[PDB]
Design a binder for this molecule. Sequence first.
Ligand SMILES: *[C@@H]1O[C@H](CO)[C@@H](O[C@@H]2O[C@H](CO)[C@@H](O[C@@H]3O[C@H](CO)[C@@H](O)[C@H](O[C@H]4O[C@H](CO)[C@@H](O)[C@H](O)[C@@H]4O[C@H]4O[C@H](CO)[C@@H](O)[C@H](O)[C@@H]4O[C@H]4O[C@H](CO)[C@@H](O)[C@H](O)[C@@H]4O)[C@@H]3O)[C@H](O)[C@H]2NC(C)=O)[C@H](O)[C@H]1NC(C)=O
Ligand SMILES: *[C@@H]1O[C@H](CO)[C@@H](O[C@@H]2O[C@H](CO)[C@@H](O[C@@H]3O[C@H](CO)[C@@H](O)[C@H](O[C@H]4O[C@H](CO)[C@@H](O)[C@H](O)[C@@H]4O[C@H]4O[C@H](CO)[C@@H](O)[C@H](O)[C@@H]4O[C@H]4O[C@H](CO)[C@@H](O)[C@H](O)[C@@H]4O)[C@@H]3O)[C@H](O)[C@H]2NC(C)=O)[C@H](O)[C@H]1NC(C)=O
Ligand SMILES: *[C@@H]1O[C@H](CO)[C@@H](O[C@@H]2O[C@H](CO)[C@@H](O[C@@H]3O[C@H](CO)[C@@H](O)[C@H](O[C@H]4O[C@H](CO)[C@@H](O)[C@H](O)[C@@H]4O[C@H]4O[C@H](CO)[C@@H](O)[C@H](O)[C@@H]4O[C@H]4O[C@H](CO)[C@@H](O)[C@H](O)[C@@H]4O)[C@@H]3O)[C@H](O)[C@H]2NC(C)=O)[C@H](O)[C@H]1NC(C)=O
Ligand SMILES: *[C@@H]1O[C@H](CO)[C@@H](O[C@@H]2O[C@H](CO)[C@@H](O[C@@H]3O[C@H](CO)[C@@H](O)[C@H](O[C@H]4O[C@H](CO)[C@@H](O)[C@H](O)[C@@H]4O[C@H]4O[C@H](CO)[C@@H](O)[C@H](O)[C@@H]4O[C@H]4O[C@H](CO)[C@@H](O)[C@H](O)[C@@H]4O)[C@@H]3O)[C@H](O)[C@H]2NC(C)=O)[C@H](O)[C@H]1NC(C)=O
Ligand SMILES: CC(=O)N[C@H]1[C@H]([C@H](O)[C@H](O)CO)OC(C(=O)O)=C[C@@H]1NC(=N)N
Ligand SMILES: CC(=O)N[C@H]1[C@H]([C@H](O)[C@H](O)CO)OC(C(=O)O)=C[C@@H]1NC(=N)N
Ligand SMILES: CC(=O)N[C@H]1[C@H]([C@H](O)[C@H](O)CO)OC(C(=O)O)=C[C@@H]1NC(=N)N
Ligand SMILES: CC(=O)N[C@H]1[C@H]([C@H](O)[C@H](O)CO)OC(C(=O)O)=C[C@@H]1NC(=N)N
Ligand SMILES: *[C@@H]1O[C@H](CO)[C@@H](O)[C@H](O)[C@H]1NC(C)=O
Ligand SMILES: *[C@@H]1O[C@H](CO)[C@@H](O)[C@H](O)[C@H]1NC(C)=O
Ligand SMILES: *[C@@H]1O[C@H](CO)[C@@H](O)[C@H](O)[C@H]1NC(C)=O
Ligand SMILES: *[C@@H]1O[C@H](CO)[C@@H](O)[C@H](O)[C@H]1NC(C)=O
Ligand SMILES: *[C@@H]1O[C@H](CO)[C@@H](O)[C@H](O)[C@H]1NC(C)=O
Ligand SMILES: *[C@@H]1O[C@H](CO)[C@@H](O)[C@H](O)[C@H]1NC(C)=O
Ligand SMILES: *[C@@H]1O[C@H](CO)[C@@H](O)[C@H](O)[C@H]1NC(C)=O
Ligand SMILES: *[C@@H]1O[C@H](CO)[C@@H](O)[C@H](O)[C@H]1NC(C)=O
Ligand SMILES: [Ca+2]
Ligand SMILES: [Ca+2]
Ligand SMILES: [Ca+2]
Ligand SMILES: [Ca+2]
Lengths: 388, 388, 388, 388
Amino acid sequence: RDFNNLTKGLCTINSWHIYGKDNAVRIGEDSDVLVTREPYVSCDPDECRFYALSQGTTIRGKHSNGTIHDRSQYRALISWPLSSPPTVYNSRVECIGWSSTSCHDGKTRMSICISGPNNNASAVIWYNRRPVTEINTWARNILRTQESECVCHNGVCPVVFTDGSATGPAETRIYYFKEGKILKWEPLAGTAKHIEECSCYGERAEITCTCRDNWQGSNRPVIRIDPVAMTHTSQYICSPVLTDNPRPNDPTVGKCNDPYPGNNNNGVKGFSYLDGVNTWLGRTISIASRSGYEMLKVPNALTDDKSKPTQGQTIVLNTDWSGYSGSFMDYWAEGECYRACFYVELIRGRPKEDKVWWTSNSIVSMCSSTEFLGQWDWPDGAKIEYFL
Amino acid sequence: RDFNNLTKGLCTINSWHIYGKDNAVRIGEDSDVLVTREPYVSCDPDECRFYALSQGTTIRGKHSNGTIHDRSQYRALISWPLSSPPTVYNSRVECIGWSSTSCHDGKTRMSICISGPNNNASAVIWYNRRPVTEINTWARNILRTQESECVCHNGVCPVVFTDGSATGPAETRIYYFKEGKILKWEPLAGTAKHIEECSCYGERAEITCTCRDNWQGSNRPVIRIDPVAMTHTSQYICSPVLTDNPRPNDPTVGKCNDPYPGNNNNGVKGFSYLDGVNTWLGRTISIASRSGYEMLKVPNALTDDKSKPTQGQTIVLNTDWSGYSGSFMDYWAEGECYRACFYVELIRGRPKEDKVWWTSNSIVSMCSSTEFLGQWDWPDGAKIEYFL
Amino acid sequence: RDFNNLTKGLCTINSWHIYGKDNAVRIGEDSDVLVTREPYVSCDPDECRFYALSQGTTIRGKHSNGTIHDRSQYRALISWPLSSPPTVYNSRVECIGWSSTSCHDGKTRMSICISGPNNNASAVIWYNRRPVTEINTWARNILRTQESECVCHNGVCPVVFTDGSATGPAETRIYYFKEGKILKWEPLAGTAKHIEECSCYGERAEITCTCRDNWQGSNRPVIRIDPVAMTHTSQYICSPVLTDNPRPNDPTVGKCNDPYPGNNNNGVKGFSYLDGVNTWLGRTISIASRSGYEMLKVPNALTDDKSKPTQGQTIVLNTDWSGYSGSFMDYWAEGECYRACFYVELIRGRPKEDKVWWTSNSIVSMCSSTEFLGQWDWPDGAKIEYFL
Amino acid sequence: RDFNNLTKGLCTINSWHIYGKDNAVRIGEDSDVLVTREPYVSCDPDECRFYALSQGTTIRGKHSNGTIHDRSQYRALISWPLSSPPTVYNSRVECIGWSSTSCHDGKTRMSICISGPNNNASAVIWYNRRPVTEINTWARNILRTQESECVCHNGVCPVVFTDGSATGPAETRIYYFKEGKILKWEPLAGTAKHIEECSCYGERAEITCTCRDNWQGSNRPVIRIDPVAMTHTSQYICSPVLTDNPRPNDPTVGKCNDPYPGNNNNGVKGFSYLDGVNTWLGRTISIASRSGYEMLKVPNALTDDKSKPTQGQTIVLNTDWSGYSGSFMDYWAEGECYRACFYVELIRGRPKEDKVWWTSNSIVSMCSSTEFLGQWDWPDGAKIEYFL
Ligand SMILES: *[C@@H]1O[C@H](CO)[C@@H](O[C@@H]2O[C@H](CO)[C@@H](O[C@@H]3O[C@H](CO)[C@@H](O)[C@H](O[C@H]4O[C@H](CO)[C@@H](O)[C@H](O)[C@@H]4O[C@H]4O[C@H](CO)[C@@H](O)[C@H](O)[C@@H]4O[C@H]4O[C@H](CO)[C@@H](O)[C@H](O)[C@@H]4O)[C@@H]3O)[C@H](O)[C@H]2NC(C)=O)[C@H](O)[C@H]1NC(C)=O
Ligand SMILES: *[C@@H]1O[C@H](CO)[C@@H](O[C@@H]2O[C@H](CO)[C@@H](O[C@@H]3O[C@H](CO)[C@@H](O)[C@H](O[C@H]4O[C@H](CO)[C@@H](O)[C@H](O)[C@@H]4O[C@H]4O[C@H](CO)[C@@H](O)[C@H](O)[C@@H]4O[C@H]4O[C@H](CO)[C@@H](O)[C@H](O)[C@@H]4O)[C@@H]3O)[C@H](O)[C@H]2NC(C)=O)[C@H](O)[C@H]1NC(C)=O
Ligand SMILES: *[C@@H]1O[C@H](CO)[C@@H](O[C@@H]2O[C@H](CO)[C@@H](O[C@@H]3O[C@H](CO)[C@@H](O)[C@H](O[C@H]4O[C@H](CO)[C@@H](O)[C@H](O)[C@@H]4O[C@H]4O[C@H](CO)[C@@H](O)[C@H](O)[C@@H]4O[C@H]4O[C@H](CO)[C@@H](O)[C@H](O)[C@@H]4O)[C@@H]3O)[C@H](O)[C@H]2NC(C)=O)[C@H](O)[C@H]1NC(C)=O
Ligand SMILES: *[C@@H]1O[C@H](CO)[C@@H](O[C@@H]2O[C@H](CO)[C@@H](O[C@@H]3O[C@H](CO)[C@@H](O)[C@H](O[C@H]4O[C@H](CO)[C@@H](O)[C@H](O)[C@@H]4O[C@H]4O[C@H](CO)[C@@H](O)[C@H](O)[C@@H]4O[C@H]4O[C@H](CO)[C@@H](O)[C@H](O)[C@@H]4O)[C@@H]3O)[C@H](O)[C@H]2NC(C)=O)[C@H](O)[C@H]1NC(C)=O
Ligand SMILES: CC(=O)N[C@H]1[C@H]([C@H](O)[C@H](O)CO)OC(C(=O)O)=C[C@@H]1NC(=N)N
Ligand SMILES: CC(=O)N[C@H]1[C@H]([C@H](O)[C@H](O)CO)OC(C(=O)O)=C[C@@H]1NC(=N)N
Ligand SMILES: CC(=O)N[C@H]1[C@H]([C@H](O)[C@H](O)CO)OC(C(=O)O)=C[C@@H]1NC(=N)N
Ligand SMILES: CC(=O)N[C@H]1[C@H]([C@H](O)[C@H](O)CO)OC(C(=O)O)=C[C@@H]1NC(=N)N
Ligand SMILES: *[C@@H]1O[C@H](CO)[C@@H](O)[C@H](O)[C@H]1NC(C)=O
Ligand SMILES: *[C@@H]1O[C@H](CO)[C@@H](O)[C@H](O)[C@H]1NC(C)=O
Ligand SMILES: *[C@@H]1O[C@H](CO)[C@@H](O)[C@H](O)[C@H]1NC(C)=O
Ligand SMILES: *[C@@H]1O[C@H](CO)[C@@H](O)[C@H](O)[C@H]1NC(C)=O
Ligand SMILES: *[C@@H]1O[C@H](CO)[C@@H](O)[C@H](O)[C@H]1NC(C)=O
Ligand SMILES: *[C@@H]1O[C@H](CO)[C@@H](O)[C@H](O)[C@H]1NC(C)=O
Ligand SMILES: *[C@@H]1O[C@H](CO)[C@@H](O)[C@H](O)[C@H]1NC(C)=O
Ligand SMILES: *[C@@H]1O[C@H](CO)[C@@H](O)[C@H](O)[C@H]1NC(C)=O
Ligand SMILES: [Ca+2]
Ligand SMILES: [Ca+2]
Ligand SMILES: [Ca+2]
Ligand SMILES: [Ca+2]
């Protein structure tokens, strides 16, 4: 109908309830399930779907060998029904590429896929399932984007791109699209030193993204965007509760405008909901690998450099593999407020489980509840020995 | 369009005709069929679908090993087209959980799934395919529900929940939902001592549920609900024709307000249509196991403590496995009256057929006819030896 | 919209062109294709679909063993997209049964399935995908019907049923349904001695059915129905070109009101288009088995007891297996006349190819052309050796 | 709604971006993917789909043996969702045949399939998924058509057919269809000596087709059609940049009205966009086999007999297999101009890779961009050794 506007604030998050789980690897042991990674969830006004970057082969197929690799001509952004596994027969291809983002503006959906060699990549913006705009690499070093949904307000959908070094200063740009066309783009501003894979959500006409500083920060950079004025700023989450991975152990005081040192040249896509005392951070339990997953309520984490957890919820036990995580919300649900949601990618295979030659994942997603619900852990559930 | 109202009475049931049969296990021997249990049937104004609790694996898949277990993070309520098998590719996930119920109110469908650890479970109510309300465990002992469809009248859909001991007194509540929100809830009232897995239907603005007394009764408890006043009462079916399983042999006189003794701490979900002389009871033929299935016309079974069968129909021969059974009706069919229907779960595998390591089922469903139709038996049809 | 009326006459048939072919057995050698038999084609106002009686198992599945049998609790009438194979995932179940018919009346579709033991079978009439009417066996000896589409005119859809002996006089009835309800039924009238599996079509407010006299005729009985007056009559096709199978060799003069002797207690479902000089008969090439298939133009075959072919078209070579054949037309196609069509069931497996333990089929269908098109043969295409 | 009219001109082509890729062979190694060849892409006003000629078997199925053959009764024109593989379960059959074309006129789609023996073939024209017109062979020697989409203007859709010798003069006709009926047909006019498999596109009320001279030309014939006047003419592309295969090496000067000699009795379907200086030609890199694929900007290639490349883009490396290629455009996309697109068939198996007994393909498609995007190569991606 008309363009969606971010007119509501976030609901109070007292706990998280189970939303969707596909059990892809369990089912894929004996079904035609596509090998994937970098999944996410995104909603249309009438349906919410699972999304991911396919590797162009099934798990049981011989071409699954070598799927640990990130970029190839055989990947594609695919979407499929909520909680179903990504199968060959029920998956819909959005575009061809090894990095992506996608969001509905209220009228129709925009999907962006980046493909190419490392030094000659390009993004093609699709709108209403047709290619509309193309952007060539500007720093000639792996043009990349969010790997989770973008957000729109009155037709304008900002998207964060990064091109250049992953272990040094790079060139990040914020593009403001409307109906697939570029209205404007800015270079990154603020105090963030490195930006990659931003996880965004919107409320009260403002868009907040929690990204990944791959170069030096263990605390996460944040970009706040004003989609009306088409401007932005960046900083780091102040809290000592560090959320990247790998990372040092938590200190007693954090850093607001500088990366917290400890781990270099590595990280993981993550997210957070920054809403005053209604603030929740997600993170792997392990400080060394993508293992376990928990949510921690850290009041004023964004601005308080000494803030520590007041409540928490374990999503995946530390004995189980996790991976990327990002944010999404059903902006078309009924209600007085936006219910915060998130997904966790559960990676199986290489590099950790090297008895198999593939790398894939399943998905688990939760949304917030105003009740204080009991918790359960949500592992992938596949027994790797069954694949030998 | 508008909320459905239970304005009709039941059609005269002179016999039962075949409605749907999926042959899931036969087909699943060489197809990507999901392992399930606790199935049921539910109608929307334009289509009737099969429902069940998936185990998150196919029958032929290696993860089918251990599917005898009731609760895990890999189960989900799924629905699929009438008489098709529950396949990986044609199944739609309604919600994540190991216990459920679901019903259409005329405008849209409400689905409820309960998940969690035994002592920290929670129910999340979905309406129009979006989560709306959440309820945390109140007795911290396996919060559970119907495992068959609920029923609505002018927007109000009562649902019976039980939390607490399965072998002792528990806390049963009747929740009255409207558009996924809680209007009110009551503690169980009346003479029923234990309630579990209620099978409900509605007619002339009243909802009747035939449940399971797992603790001590071999006769079934009944809950009658008034969805307008939002009140209820309970008692037991008076008839000496006992319908739980396992159970003692039929006596000459039954009990109206007390459980009929004989078997303790066990049972099976079942149902009945209580309509004066137009009363039919369903039951396993075997008094010891979930074997065989028959329908018996027992006039005034609800109030006559000496009532015995006047007519009958064998659905499944005693040499064949049966299982859960419940009620449903197409409230949107044309006609002067509601045609009574029911389904029978046909369990294959463990614990009875222990040569295989899995437990699954197929479904058979019948609806009433005013004609006196000839009978046939409807077994699962799978030869277990084919799975070794 | 409104009920369809048979207001047109048949187009001139100068030859036949290929309409649909599913190659089910070829594809089913390595795909989840259901085992079937007794297929047919039927159109809705917006789509034409393939129909058949499933055996409730795939061809490669172990339960395919024994599918030569006609009646069991595992059969169901299924429909699927034109020219696709009947797969587990794309097939829609219309009803449960081992004998059927189905037709669209312009508003919605009626499907009838008969199930039961030989001496206690029953038909349940579905309309708009809901059961509406049920009919119990009247002669207690395999209640059976058309096995191809029925035809409607202004809401009235006659259907021919037969109950009783297949090798002696039986009780045939013509039921006139409207919206799934019985308006009236008649006992068979005219000179036909035995009727089974009628293949019907309609034109200019009259319905013609070419059936099978299993008892003694090698010439086919014909039933002409007036759907307005709801009356009918029957006779045999006069032509010496015999069309049942098995059958004696063609004589020089046929029989109009008596069965032509030669073969007893056997036959095959077939059809014909009887339209004065625009008359075409279909038949197996072999007089001994269901092998080969050809169409022969035999002017005035219905009334001329000496009529012989004036033109012909080979559909399946005598070295290839054929089987049942029946008529259907797209009554909703644009145009001044109804284009005659037909399908041929291509049976593979038992009893002829006994190296395999199953029996299944694929389908080929053609429609008429006013051009004189070149001919090609259309075999099943599967190599049985590939299934050992 | 209404018939589409070719009112726009072509967008400026500065480079090509990736549009769709199905990775059919990679996925088909362990999925129910149909064996195909002769693919193409065609758009409806609301969706663009992949099309191809099925061989009626899956790649892994035993019937894939011998699929190198061109014509059989088991082929069919099938369509499926963009970038998905052609699977047994998601493919839609358009018609039965071993040669085809198809296009949407704005209101509905016309599909044409030719089937038959070499000396008695026939084309049946389908419109709105119903057969409407039939044309019998005129030269009795493999009646054949485009093997890529046709184009319409105000309801009129010209289609080029060829019947007769492939190594000598043949009879080519241009049929002008409207709603599936023949308005008129012409014999080939102009200087082209042999025409086969025309690849067409339209702009500013004119339709241009780049075909294949199988008899003697290494330069391609071109047919320009005026769909309003229903007339046409033909010539050869003047440029010395030869685009058929096999072919001699490029000369310094080409031929405008004669075939350029060098290779006899062979070729490959190809295409070009002829638009003054905005002219791009596609061709295999290899002059000997269907290997590699590149696009070359050759200003005024159609009329300048000395024109040479000014820019280029490699699509498939010469070390990778290619095959047929053709044109298509989304005439229903928003915008001021028509964005040129094309597809490349990537043949795997026989005759080049003879370790397997089958022949199939996958598809890659690109559309033009006004940006100068970086290039990447797009191979099939399957490792043949995995099929042994
Ligand atoms: C029924 O359901 C309800 C709902 O779930 C259950 O109640 C919930 O129970 C939770 C578990 O106790 C409880 O969560 C905890 O809440 C406290 C705040 O009250 C929070 O501090 C906890 O978080 C710390 O502890 C966990 C381990 O338990 C750590 O993994 C987590 O990261 C937090 O500790 C780490 O970070 C802190 C901040 O920097 C450090 O101070 C601390 O030393 C520790 O640091 C180390 O570990 C880090 C991670 O490995 C590492 O990075 C760092 O470098 C150090 O090495 C936790 O969230 C819920 O609040 C509670 N919910 C409610 C409503 O009550 C109930 O029990 C269930 N019933 C039953 C029977 O189970
Ligand atoms: C063509 O089709 C028609 C339609 O189906 C056929 O006619 C039908 O035929 C049915 C079979 O005879 C007939 O059903 C029977 O009807 C009588 C009432 O008239 C009913 O009592 C029968 O039910 C008892 O018998 C069956 C065994 O046959 C038991 O399984 C059942 O539970 C009933 O008996 C048990 O419960 C009773 C009540 O307490 C006890 O009195 C009795 O002793 C017995 O108890 C033991 O068994 C129990 C179960 O194991 C156990 O719990 C208990 O503790 C004891 O150990 C049955 O329903 C239909 O009424 C009839 N329909 C019509 C319209 O006529 C026709 O025959 C078909 N034609 C052909 C050739 O087959
Ligand atoms: C390009 O395409 C066109 C279009 O197809 C081709 O032209 C067509 O060619 C057809 C083949 O010649 C031709 O069909 C024939 O037409 C004649 C009438 O003109 C018709 O009689 C033929 O039918 C008899 O013959 C076939 C065997 O060829 C039999 O199978 C068939 O049943 C008919 O014969 C049997 O029945 C008769 C009637 O009772 C008996 O008189 C006769 O003896 C025979 O009886 C025995 O066989 C029976 C079946 O086994 C058995 O029951 C009985 O008891 C006896 O044992 C046939 O239809 C088309 O008419 C013609 N079409 C046109 C428009 O011209 C053209 O050739 C193609 N080009 C090339 C190069 O192939
Ligand atoms: C990042 O991305 C951009 C965009 O892709 C990259 O820039 C592009 O780079 C391309 C590669 O250099 C460049 O394409 C070339 O452009 C020139 C015109 O400037 C064009 O002539 C080239 O085409 C010839 O060369 C290729 C081999 O490289 C041949 O395969 C091709 O057919 C052309 O040569 C043949 O035909 C000519 C005409 O007849 C003959 O003169 C010539 O001798 C040769 O003939 C032989 O080969 C034929 C084919 O086998 C055979 O039939 C014949 O008989 C003879 O045997 C080519 O298209 C793009 O123009 C350029 N794009 C832009 C916007 O700049 C950039 O490099 C990327 N960055 C990095 C680091 O890679
Ligand atoms: C464009 C690209 O390849 N992005 C990478 C990403 C990247 O390596 C880091 O952010 C550092 O630059 O890391 C990872 C990762 O698992 O850490 C997966 C992403 N894979 C894919 N998006 N395909
Ligand atoms: C919540 C739960 O696990 N319910 C159980 C149910 C339960 O054990 C009895 O009612 C006694 O409490 O029994 C059975 C059963 O087969 O008897 C299956 C149900 N399984 C599932 N709903 N998953
Ligand atoms: C109801 C029934 O079983 N009908 C039979 C039919 C029947 O045997 C003859 O007409 C003689 O009565 O023959 C055959 C047959 O192949 O000849 C298949 C049918 N199979 C099925 N409809 N399932
Ligand atoms: C009708 C027909 O069979 N056309 C052939 C085509 C033909 O051989 C040449 O154009 C010369 O006539 O060549 C080829 C080919 O790969 O070269 C495939 C086509 N295959 C199919 N369309 N099925
Ligand atoms: C969003 O706001 C604009 C005006 O700012 C309005 O045109 C549009 O309709 C609004 N969207 C919705 C969904 O109401
Ligand atoms: C996978 O590929 C590697 C590298 O090509 C090879 O060594 C290994 O054996 C392969 N594993 C399997 C299961 O094919
Ligand atoms: C149900 O009853 C209410 C009034 O009690 C009415 O608003 C509603 O439309 C009725 N439902 C239907 C389907 O007529
Ligand atoms: C199933 O699992 C059990 C317990 O882990 C094991 O003993 C058994 O061998 C397994 N059966 C199969 C067929 O894998
Ligand atoms: C069929 O005829 C009846 C009147 O005899 C009419 O009501 C109906 O609309 C007609 N059907 C169509 C499709 O026109
Ligand atoms: C099929 O079943 C028969 C009879 O039960 C048996 O003899 C035969 O061996 C079976 N064939 C196969 C392939 O299982
Ligand atoms: C195409 O042109 C004709 C008149 O020449 C017009 O009737 C038709 O509507 C036009 N098509 C569109 C899509 O506007
Ligand atoms: C394929 O068929 C040929 C010819 O019939 C035969 O020689 C060859 O062995 C077959 N190949 C396979 C893999 O079946
Ligand atoms: Ca980092
Ligand atoms: Ca009990
Ligand atoms: Ca006969
Ligand atoms: Ca050539």
